[model samples]
Target: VEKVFFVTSPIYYVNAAPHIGHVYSTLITDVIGRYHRVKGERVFALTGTDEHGQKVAEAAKQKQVSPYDFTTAVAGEFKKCFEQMDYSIDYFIRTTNEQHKAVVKELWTKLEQKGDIYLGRYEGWYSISDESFLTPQNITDGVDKDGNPCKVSLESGHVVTWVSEENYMFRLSAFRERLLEWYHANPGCIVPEFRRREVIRAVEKGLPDLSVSRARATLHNWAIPVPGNPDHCVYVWLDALTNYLTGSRLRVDESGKEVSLVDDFNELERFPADVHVIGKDILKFHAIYWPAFLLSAGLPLPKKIVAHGWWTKNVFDPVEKAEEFGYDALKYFLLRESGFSDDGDYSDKNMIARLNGELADTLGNLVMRCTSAKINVNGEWPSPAAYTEEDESLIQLIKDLPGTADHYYLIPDIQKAIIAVFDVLRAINAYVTDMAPWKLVKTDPERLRTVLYITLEGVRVTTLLLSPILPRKSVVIFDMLGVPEVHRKGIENFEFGAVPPGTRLGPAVEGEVLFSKRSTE
Candidate 1:
């Protein structure tokens, strides 16, 4: 049997409702998983809720429910959003699950037995909103309306509280240099190029003392208790990272049998994680702290940490902007300007412009016009005649598509792959306009058949390349062109001449648009 591929989104913190950021990350991962699956890889995609933070406890209190009940409701809503968006997740791991809590306790015992964990006191600036602690460097001195030195916003807050109590600390500092060296040796191990630079710079600046565990009074009492220490609960970052292992069935089998929950380097060598897709804000937790913790636990390092860019929203003057212009503009801007590394701002106006201008006008129109003409003139799927100079040129472009798309998708650059598909669409549209297939239909039917055949071949290639990104839409196009079930055959097994001659073509699905224009309301 082939080795299975495991990919995961950072389990979302359940302190708030799911937002656009959550959907963006989930959609990207889903697209990647779908690509691998279509390529015949045994792929597992995991996503879930992190329900064991002080923030969750506080939110539960505000909701007049237990932390478990609140998280259960919130997790349901989160799962519903993914389902609504057609996310293909294999396993949904919830930290509140009994099996996961047990795995957390078992891992805690293993780390403690390795002498990497120690009882200590944690006193620091904690951000309830972000569910993280801050160092003195994280806070900045600024004056509020009262003109006193008030800690700035959470992003720039500097206030730290001095407290003394017994807690647990993992020996993370011991592995700091090793983690830095690992990152240095493996360039692009963390992605979006600038994020890799950011990690290296952070390691160069040195690490802060990481608090790995917390006591009930210092934080909350809703988290999993540290093994052999009931008074203290594992901190949010520590508990959350454990979910990756727990969700993978690394700590237990399907029959509820406990496995060796070993944290040894040799054991980890057998189960190395392939990729960890994370957001930019928590780069420190994943790049710096998580690796150190793994090393301290005597585990091997993960293969890569791919940090994605952030998503922002732009609010423009509603009165000044054209209604269609704003919507289409934002869509084009996002599809063109936004990428894996850069931040994508949401805008109503820009979205509509791109949808109408790119999807509706350029790509969609190209498909509709070409296929519609074929049905009108030939009344069947057009067959290729001897290639003309123009026909050969277009065929060459279509043939180059699979190679180009595979190059990007193989490296998991989803945005680049998507852009390449649209590029093909643009090229085919331009070729159709230049060929004037409609004019050829009346005067030179043979030449028109050749042009339509090339156009249909281009459509076939486009659908295959885009199946991973938009499977359902691709299927619709295949069916519209009278080539349904083409994907059931392997992409490698497909050839340019596979589209049979004289096959009866079907009408394009009525009222079935590939993408809808975004509504400002």
Candidate 2:
């Protein structure tokens, strides 16, 4: 059997244009999928827009366009954003796709036939902002935009209104015990231990039947209609979550019909997604409700739910930033600087400082210094001689890099993983200063070759490790060093000395600095 790695970013709500938050989630997902692909796994990565809900309808009305047209433009913005950022998304799944809607109805029918869905009258607080119903206990008092007292969701600070209507209900209460059992059995299924604990506590408290439909009039016909009920629509979350399955294991036949994975596991090539990358804000939806729905329908639950942190600052125009600092520079800054599971503050001052000082100064400076014509007169990869304490120590660190970084990357702890790459850079920098290859240039040319060889090899390995995060720039570096395509294969092939000694370096060409220092202005 072939090894398969399937991953997805949450389908973003199309109510608003793409922001740094969407960029963050997609970047993280792209990096994870790229990492697995680099490790020789056949990877399937999915991302797209979530276009069904009251939030979208409201945004559409404000824009004076039909909901479908409004969602179309906004979804285009997201796809274009990803294109500019160079994120390698395998499939872009929109909830508005006719095929996707068919899949959602099929899932609804499955749950209904299994007796996990029923008709009921629901009376509770509903949040249009969150597109979900909130329990009374989770509701709190707050002031709305007009400064009048209003009921708001304690979990999301969004205002909620009392809703009482007949709707289809999912028997969420029936899955509470089973969800808890699954959690206990697979404690590591959710990435951040604290989030898992929170999910467990919420399940322990109790799970009430979830209202899974909104009246047609309520949503203004802006949602996927509930399977048999033309008067109501499927819950937005249910419709959106099914997009993951639609992109993966679920297949569309020649007749333009959806073939449910429930009927035949082999209908498609991939299933039981390896990871779902989402924001910490929507943890409960992915960890609790999503799994409950899958379990009820007898489908396999996703293997892991990786809930990452959020950006606190208002994101500047991503296009402007990507143009100014370069895509890899921005990508490196976010993945390397932000704490993986904690909120981060973004600022141009800090961004420029990091790019200039950390990335430009360290990695860029090291590679330039090592490959400079003045340093390596022969313009070829040098051979190393007998080792010294400094040489052995540096080589050992490079040898241990892939494994050390692999640990954090598996946790999807991007910050720590990139930190590991920097550690090697720092070690090699120190090695250069102590050995003084430039000073040895006139006095000890042979020893200088050894020093430069070790330092360049360190650069090669670190560049390989950072490739998944900085795909575009790493390609340039590999080309400059004349590293062969075969040597740049999977992480398994990322061994030390893969670049043969004495290979002539590529034309000492353009002064294309890997990362240029950006102006704060």
Candidate 3:
């Protein structure tokens, strides 16, 4: 087996434009994938647009264009957003690819041959907002503004209508006990214990065989035709989830043509996945539906399914002032400030608070003063002989962090890892504030040199630790400090005084502040 670490963002939508929420999810997985990659792990981080669906088809018609052209244009916008955000995603797949269609063919037959799928007259309420079908029990009683009664899906608040059509159904009812067994056997398969319980309870509530295909007439022939039955189209969700399988470089274009692309893998493998980072609302799809599809296909389950909470814009624009700072500042806010396991409210106050409080004052000011204030200081990077108790204590905190922060990967929570990085920065900030190397500049020249050396080393280690999260911040400062690329081998290589005793610093240089302070003026 190839030594591999893996991650994925839920395939984004080409049916609609990207939003702050999409940016959050992509950044979380990208940061995680980058973490493993930085550790010299062969990591695959897959993200793309889920383009084939009734919504895309209808949206295209509303725009008076062909579905392929509409999806292509919207997908272009999606790719642009990720690029501008600088997401380190490995594969940007579109579900409309013939390669994905090929996988969907096998996915259907595998379930079908296993006797899990069958032809039946399908009848249910289908929510366009939620691509899946809804049952009476799944809906709530509500009235439309016109005073006519309507059945609303309590889960999504989208109104539903009675739908009856001949379709192929997957035997989700048969997997109830087996799915529960997997959860019990693999206790932490889901990040928080409660999320697992929620899935189990839904299964316990009762599951009907899921309608897996639609009458070909319904989607206007805009979907992948069901294998062995051109009269039906394989359901869109099924088509979309298989994008994970298409993680490698080669994907078949519209005419069964293979287009060579990214090295998320130069080609691909479908057996194991490190984690599937998804949102909570979509649990039923992953926990119940997708897993059954795997078992029926004889494919293995993803090692973990990490459900991150939703980001609501509470008081202000969630996307405010971030594009100006580029991705790192927003990435830092998402990781450091937000609680990863629960829903969080986003606002400019929270964003500005983080930028001004931590990025600017703590990490930014520390490095700017360290690099910008060097006026021919007669010392090396880590002048150990002149170190004090304060320096030693902060250095130990820096040295011990990578090991301590390893636990966050269980939940794959970015906030905890971020908290650890800031703890070290706060330690350094406090150490420098208390030590007052500037005062020693006049009274004690040797102690001043020693203090600057320790602060420089502190900046060096913290920069490396924070690099995997706040990317550009570290790169700019590292160049100013003359930090080389070799140090990125892994955090394990980060020792207390690793910067070397006689290392000469850089920049006597530029106006590139790592982060500019947020201000009303």
Candidate 4:
């Protein structure tokens, strides 16, 4: 059966420069998108800024600007950051989009009619940083870094304050058993196993009637107002979670004409969100609350929730050293260094190590020298006529490598699939050492011709295999090896056909196409 695959990077709240954490989540979704695109699947992936909420209003007030201006500037920065990272984001949605706001208002009334929403007095401990209402029991005793006594929210570690106001509330408690049943029945609903178990425990225990609005006075009037009552605004989570529904259409060069430009869907019929890639910290919102909200409104639940980990900061690093890391450094380090669902450290030391070793040394050096002046032997392609066991072994490995990596390439797990490509690289270097091509040039020039030919094919196979991760590097290396444009097609099948043995290797570019080692700044 064919499936319409949809994926999303959690909409980022733009109160500051989207840090490394934001980059990590977006990259995860982008890689998944590229993986599927290569597999010939019709995939839709989305990411954008979350502009509404009290936190944005507060940050805007501090900057002495209207929330609109603040939202735009912050949103603009996110767009720029995405570009800087070269992420393959198809849509950059803003929460302020009229289409998004309208969906929230329309869905609001639908839930209200179901009696899942009602007017009530809400008094609870709320965390400004988290933009979430907290039960008193959710607070923990803690001392600030300066040793000041404070009670922080256990979930986010943000200081919580008691707030009492009249607002709209969602009957979240009513869905407790429904949520438990859905979660228990769907084993793969939340990935990394641990996150699913965590959510199941939370749902099985109990749920509070969620406060779905905040008083205008407290929010500084900077959110989507609750329908019918202008004095209160829909809670940030309720409003923000609907972005997935809004972006389900064909926006850029797309043809999903029926999805609507801005209005008129009772609930999506063909829309089944395939996965929500989110951080472990906010897993609760996506897994528990968002699903319940959709169920209450008679909408379909997302197929899966993937909760990933964090990159801890280096507190000791000084301000000047910040520029030492950029997109490739950040992207490679996060995806490679961390297991998908565990906390990973982000020290500059670890980043520098991976950049030099894996990229500059292992992957980069292999391509550079073969396409360099030192290895002038590959100037013309030679025949594979006299195959050494060594030559046959290397060719078979590169041929088999793509299909091996293709297992993880399509969907679900691109993270480990990278190592499959890495294994091929290690094999290439090992084959070179076994052939001693450097020595072959001095004695056995005939065998040397075959060795260089097979090695070039290894680089060709690798360029296609690693294209999703290192785009610039891949294109440049292919050009240097004299590979034909047609040879580059069939990415979805991911099969690397051998180039005719007598094909001519192109002349190398004079200077470095890589290892320019541009500063992170």
Candidate 5:
């Protein structure tokens, strides 16, 4: 049987233009998907705009166009941003697609038939910016950072008011205790460690009253109509969460490929999702409400829900600080600063810092030096040889790399995987410095070949390990070393002799530096 890997970025809200945060999340998932694809997994990567919401409706009104037309226009911009960033996403699922609408409605009917949903009046604080209803406890009296008043009026503060109306409500409270139990049994079900703790604590403290459906008068006409009630729309969370199933083709596709919708035992066996990658902010939705919905619908829960940390911007020292730090510096800082636990800031300066320092200086430099030196010294690609203590240490580290790093990559731990790649680079640099192959070239040619051979082998290993993170650059390195098309093999099947001995090494790609130095100006 073939293993399938499904990866996704949070379906973005089209309330505003795509920002650095969107790029960060999408880029990380793209890298992960590309890596898995190279490892020969049947990978399905889904990312796209969340076009239906009160905010989108309002934005369309502001632009004097129909909500559907406005979102359709903005969806193009979102796709353009991914393209500009070279994202390799497999499918772009727009919730507005008719197929998606049908899947969502069908799923709702299944949940309703299972007696998990009911008609109830909804009255609460809603945040248009977030496209979510906020609990009263989350509401604060102080003015917001945007200088808006602390009032709950929709015009000023982010919250909106809605009169009570008959709408569907999922039996969220029914599963609160059960979900809490699941969290204890599955400790690592949530990620960044602390987030898991926070979620468990929240569930222990008891869940708030959840409103799972919305009346059409409360939402906009652009939403998917609630089945059996044309006057009501499925709540934002219900509509949004269904994207997972709709995007997966458990039901249909963009080209209108029809498949029977299944939410029972047999369907669960075939379409059991391995993981659901979501942001920290929505932990409650996925971890709490979503599982409740699934259990109520008589479907098996996903194997895991991996909630990752947020990528924020450096707030304190926004301008001058960013200029000094540069893109490469910022990139590395973000990667190292925020692993699986904390959120990293997104700033122009920070991104530039990371691009230059980590990518350009560290990883990019290693590739350039290793390949260039090999071509210049022996005029041929070096192969693996018997190792010295120094070579042994580096080689051992290289050998253990795939296993050590696979956990992070498999869980879609983008920041961790990037850091691991650099850590290996640091190891390679230290080994090369200590062995000093340049010195051995004249006085001890045989010893030098061993050292150089070990170094080249290490570089090959690095190419395979880091290929998922930096696909284009990794391909360049593989091509330079004459490794051919070896990316389709998994890390388990990776072998040492993949780089043949005495193969003529090609010159480094012209003017292509893997990473460039971050500019201080």
Candidate 6:
């Protein structure tokens, strides 16, 4: 059987409500998964909440609720939010699940048996907010709320305190050079290459044995205990990272019982994930620690760790925007506005401008103009009679769209891929304006059909190209163009002229316009 394409958004920490940053990560993953699925590949996309450790316990205490209840409510909120976003997640694995605990315990045993993990005493400054240990260099002096001096993390400015406890340790130091070697051989493991180099430099500096467990007492028993030892609990990061593996393997029938492939890596269908979509905040955990753990388990590292930048304060509620402007327009604005490599600040003005300028004016107007009953009296997709210099020129542009967009989508560059499609849309719109098909209907009737034919065909192909990003609205557009359900499946069907001539157009939804313009101050 062929291997399935696996992609993941980091299981979000449930200490806070879902935000635009969280949605951005999941949206990127969904787009990639949708792209592969449309390309005729089987895809498995995983996302859920990380509901373990100090964060949850403290938050629950503050909220006056049980940890289980807290995680359940917050996780439900996350699920609800993603549902509104219409993401295609195959499995939503929370670390609090029984199966997840079993997997975490089993992985602990594997590493312990390999002698990669051993009992040890950890003494360092621990950041509850960051959920990791910090060495002296990572800590800095800072003043707290009362203007009292306190030690804080240089990375996040979160307050840290000295913690000394007996726990299980992973020989992360031993794998430092090996990790570098793996990255050297597979340089593309981290996207944007610069982030890859940063990982390399960090590893080059040093690696210390990582604390893989915290005292069970410290966490108020809100975490998965170390396998066979209730005195200690599995560290949150280790427990969380195992979720990818939990999502990767499918249970198989062994005799009368179901068996998971976690015990044996060879039978794992999606062990080496195609991509792990994450934020820049947790790059080290995913890039370094996760790979080292996989190596110790004799498993393959994920193919790529794509870390994206965060969104700033100037953001809107995802659900609110989805309702106001439509999900497709909101999705398009996100991918078009921000590239993955740098931080982005959301602006309502910029969003309104892009939506109105490109989507409403260019693509939406082109579709309505071509499909209008005035221009296409038969209300059917017309077949071109013959090619004029201008007609073939326009058709050539349409033919080039798939390859151009495919190149960027493979780079997973949503911005450039959208640009590639719209570049053609702009050209086709200009062609329509230049051809003046309405004028042709009076002077040269046959020529008018060819003009509308070429223009509508361009719209069809561009809509197909943008389908992965603008799934919601594309369906409506596909309806207007009379595209067949059969033609919508797989990128293999992305060729021009797939729609047959005389196929009657579907009715547009009443009071629902494609890319409807929104007025904002």
TM-score of each: 0.85, 0.94, 0.91, 0.86, 0.86, 0.94
Task: Please give the range of 10 consecutive residues that has the lowest summed lDDT in model 4.
Answer: 311-320
Tens-digit lDDT track of model 6 for 1-521: 48888899998888888999789899999999998887789887888889998878998999999998999999999988998999877777788877778888888999999999998989989999889788999999997778788989988887899999987999999999889999999877798678888999999999999999998889889999888888889999999999988777646343312345455544656767889988888899999999999999887888888887773115569999878777888889889887866756567888899999999999999989887877888888777788888788889989988998888877667789999999999999899899898888779878887898888888988988888899977888888988888888677677877777888888755565777787878
Better of 2 and 4 by TM-score: 2
lDDT of 3: 0.75
Highest-lDDT candidate: 6
- Candidate of highest TM-score: 2
Cα lDDT of model 3 by residue, 1-521, tens digit: 66467788888667677787777778878888887876667777778888877777987998899998999998888888888887777667889876777777866777888898998977778887677688777898887768578778888776677789988988888888888888889988887677888888888888788888998888888889998889999888888777776664454355433575443442455336788888777778888898888877777788788877773113222344465554688788777766646656556676787789988999888887666554225524645455567667876887787666666744677788778878988888888888776777678776766677777877887777677787776777777777667875575556766666666666554566678886643
lDDT tens digits, residue span 1-521, model 1: 25556677888888777776676666666766777777666676777888987778877898889887899999998887777666677767788887788767777887888887887766666656555667666766676556776564356242334445566877766766897789878876787677888778877876656677777765569888877777778888788887777766644346433454454323333335567777776777888877876776666677777777763115343223423343223223433646765656456555666666676777667667767844346557676779878777777877877788887776667678768878878888888888888788678887777778778778777777667665666666677777756443366623566677686666656676655555645
**Cα shift from native, residue 480, model 3 (Å):** 1.8
lDDT of each: 0.69, 0.84, 0.75, 0.75, 0.68, 0.85
- The predicted structure with the larger TM-score, 2 or 5, is 2
**How close to the true structure is residue 146 of candidate 3, measured as C-alpha lDDT?**
80
lDDT of 4: 0.75
lDDT of 2 at 346: 68
lDDT of 4 by residue, 41-146 (tens): 6777889888888888888988999999999998988887777778777778888888788888888998999999999988878888788777777899887768
Error of 1 at 276 (Å): 2.1
Off by over 4 Å in 5: 142-157, 160-162, 250-270, 311-337, 340-357, 373-376, 383-386, 492-497, 508-512
Candidate 6 weakest ten by summed lDDT: 252-261
Model 2 Cα RMSD, 1 decimal: 2.8
Alpha carbon lDDT at 92, candidate 3: 77
User: Once superposed on the true structure, which residue ranges of model 2 sit more than 4 Å away at CA?
Assistant: 250-267, 311-315, 518-521
